[PDB]
Scaffold this motif. Sequence first.
Motif, PDB file in Angstrom:
ATOM      1  N   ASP A  81       0.787  -1.200   0.000  1.00  0.00           N
ATOM      2  CA  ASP A  81       0.000   0.000   0.000  1.00  0.00           C
ATOM      3  C   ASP A  81       0.822   1.255   0.000  1.00  0.00           C
ATOM      4  O   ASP A  81       1.779   1.373   0.758  1.00  0.00           O
ATOM      5  N   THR A  82       0.521   2.149  -0.914  1.00  0.00           N
ATOM      6  CA  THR A  82       1.195   3.438  -0.849  1.00  0.00           C
ATOM      7  C   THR A  82       0.435   4.208   0.201  1.00  0.00           C
ATOM      8  O   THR A  82      -0.814   4.235   0.247  1.00  0.00           O
ATOM      9  N   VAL A  83       1.186   4.840   1.091  1.00  0.00           N
ATOM     10  CA  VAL A  83       0.568   5.662   2.148  1.00  0.00           C
ATOM     11  C   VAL A  83       1.176   7.033   2.232  1.00  0.00           C
ATOM     12  O   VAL A  83       2.351   7.273   1.777  1.00  0.00           O
ATOM     13  N   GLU A  84       0.377   7.966   2.695  1.00  0.00           N
ATOM     14  CA  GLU A  84       0.874   9.284   2.926  1.00  0.00           C
ATOM     15  C   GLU A  84       0.953   9.472   4.474  1.00  0.00           C
ATOM     16  O   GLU A  84      -0.038   9.214   5.193  1.00  0.00           O
ATOM     17  N   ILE A  85       2.075   9.927   5.000  1.00  0.00           N
ATOM     18  CA  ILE A  85       2.210  10.207   6.420  1.00  0.00           C
ATOM     19  C   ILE A  85       2.541  11.660   6.625  1.00  0.00           C
ATOM     20  O   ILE A  85       3.194  12.285   5.777  1.00  0.00           O
ATOM     21  N   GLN A  86       2.035  12.235   7.702  1.00  0.00           N
ATOM     22  CA  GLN A  86       2.313  13.604   8.089  1.00  0.00           C
ATOM     23  C   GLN A  86       2.732  13.572   9.545  1.00  0.00           C
ATOM     24  O   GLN A  86       2.115  12.849  10.353  1.00  0.00           O
ATOM     25  N   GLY A  87       3.742  14.343   9.898  1.00  0.00           N
ATOM     26  CA  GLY A  87       4.204  14.396  11.279  1.00  0.00           C
ATOM     27  C   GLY A  87       5.441  15.232  11.374  1.00  0.00           C
ATOM     28  O   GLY A  87       5.762  15.971  10.434  1.00  0.00           O
ATOM     29  N   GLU A  88       6.133  15.103  12.481  1.00  0.00           N
ATOM     30  CA  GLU A  88       7.345  15.913  12.721  1.00  0.00           C
ATOM     31  C   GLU A  88       8.609  15.151  12.661  1.00  0.00           C
ATOM     32  O   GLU A  88       8.694  14.028  13.153  1.00  0.00           O
ATOM     33  N   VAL A  89       9.611  15.774  12.045  1.00  0.00           N
ATOM     34  CA  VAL A  89      10.956  15.186  12.043  1.00  0.00           C
ATOM     35  C   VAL A  89      11.427  15.303  13.509  1.00  0.00           C
ATOM     36  O   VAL A  89      11.333  16.373  14.109  1.00  0.00           O
ATOM     37  N   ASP A  90      11.853  14.191  14.110  1.00  0.00           N
ATOM     38  CA  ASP A  90      12.353  14.135  15.502  1.00  0.00           C
ATOM     39  C   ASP A  90      13.798  13.714  15.328  1.00  0.00           C
ATOM     40  O   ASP A  90      14.095  12.547  15.065  1.00  0.00           O
ATOM     41  N   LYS A  91      14.704  14.655  15.540  1.00  0.00           N
ATOM     42  CA  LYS A  91      16.111  14.388  15.307  1.00  0.00           C
ATOM     43  C   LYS A  91      16.868  14.668  16.540  1.00  0.00           C
ATOM     44  O   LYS A  91      16.746  15.731  17.129  1.00  0.00           O
ATOM     45  N   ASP A  92      17.666  13.675  16.918  1.00  0.00           N
ATOM     46  CA  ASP A  92      18.532  13.746  18.101  1.00  0.00           C
ATOM     47  C   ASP A  92      19.946  13.441  17.670  1.00  0.00           C
ATOM     48  O   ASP A  92      20.181  13.141  16.552  1.00  0.00           O
ATOM     49  N   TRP A  93      20.887  13.448  18.619  1.00  0.00           N
ATOM     50  CA  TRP A  93      22.271  13.155  18.272  1.00  0.00           C
ATOM     51  C   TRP A  93      22.461  11.778  17.654  1.00  0.00           C
ATOM     52  O   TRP A  93      23.316  11.589  16.792  1.00  0.00           O
ATOM     53  N   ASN A  94      21.592  10.833  18.005  1.00  0.00           N
ATOM     54  CA  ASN A  94      21.757   9.508  17.519  1.00  0.00           C
ATOM     55  C   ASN A  94      20.659   8.994  16.632  1.00  0.00           C
ATOM     56  O   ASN A  94      20.690   7.835  16.273  1.00  0.00           O
ATOM     57  N   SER A  95      19.723   9.836  16.267  1.00  0.00           N
ATOM     58  CA  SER A  95      18.668   9.212  15.471  1.00  0.00           C
ATOM     59  C   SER A  95      17.814  10.245  14.766  1.00  0.00           C
ATOM     60  O   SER A  95      17.797  11.416  15.126  1.00  0.00           O
ATOM     61  N   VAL A  96      17.109   9.794  13.722  1.00  0.00           N
ATOM     62  CA  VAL A  96      16.142  10.692  13.105  1.00  0.00           C
ATOM     63  C   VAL A  96      14.943   9.777  12.900  1.00  0.00           C
ATOM     64  O   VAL A  96      15.077   8.535  12.643  1.00  0.00           O
ATOM     65  N   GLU A  97      13.749  10.292  13.152  1.00  0.00           N
ATOM     66  CA  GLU A  97      12.561   9.469  12.965  1.00  0.00           C
ATOM     67  C   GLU A  97      11.457  10.499  12.655  1.00  0.00           C
ATOM     68  O   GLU A  97      11.612  11.712  12.785  1.00  0.00           O
ATOM     69  N   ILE A  98      10.356  10.009  12.166  1.00  0.00           N
ATOM     70  CA  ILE A  98       9.184  10.859  11.983  1.00  0.00           C
ATOM     71  C   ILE A  98       8.146  10.484  13.049  1.00  0.00           C
ATOM     72  O   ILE A  98       7.824   9.285  13.187  1.00  0.00           O
ATOM     73  N   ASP A  99       7.635  11.462  13.797  1.00  0.00           N
ATOM     74  CA  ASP A  99       6.553  11.152  14.798  1.00  0.00           C
ATOM     75  C   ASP A  99       5.298  11.376  14.003  1.00  0.00           C
ATOM     76  O   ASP A  99       4.966  12.518  13.704  1.00  0.00           O
ATOM     77  N   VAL A 100       4.596  10.300  13.682  1.00  0.00           N
ATOM     78  CA  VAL A 100       3.457  10.406  12.784  1.00  0.00           C
ATOM     79  C   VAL A 100       2.155  10.863  13.414  1.00  0.00           C
ATOM     80  O   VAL A 100       1.670  10.237  14.398  1.00  0.00           O
TER      81      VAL A 100
END
Length: 93
Positions: free
Chosen positions: A68-87
């Motif tokens: 499934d193609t999906v669209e996600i919206q949220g915030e880039v959460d970037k720390d010294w050791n990681s980057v993730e999207i909080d959806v």
Amino acid sequence: QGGFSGPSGSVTTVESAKSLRDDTWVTLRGNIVERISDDLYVFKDASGTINVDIDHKRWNGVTVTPKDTVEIQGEVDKDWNSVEIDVKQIRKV
């Protein structure tokens, strides 16, 4: 030099989202390809992969598989050791 970063049309690539500043609102399109742990998933688009945090309440009755193609919206959460999207929202497209 401040303001609100959030919803009020641009879809950003996964690879470029990794370069954005912490606490930046983004919209991505791609596929959820693996669940890595509680609420942490791997999201892939043609440019790369990134980990995304999707709370149980975001699904809203929608079942998503890797095809499934999906669209996600949220915030880039970037720390010294990681980057993730909080959806905040996930929808099939």
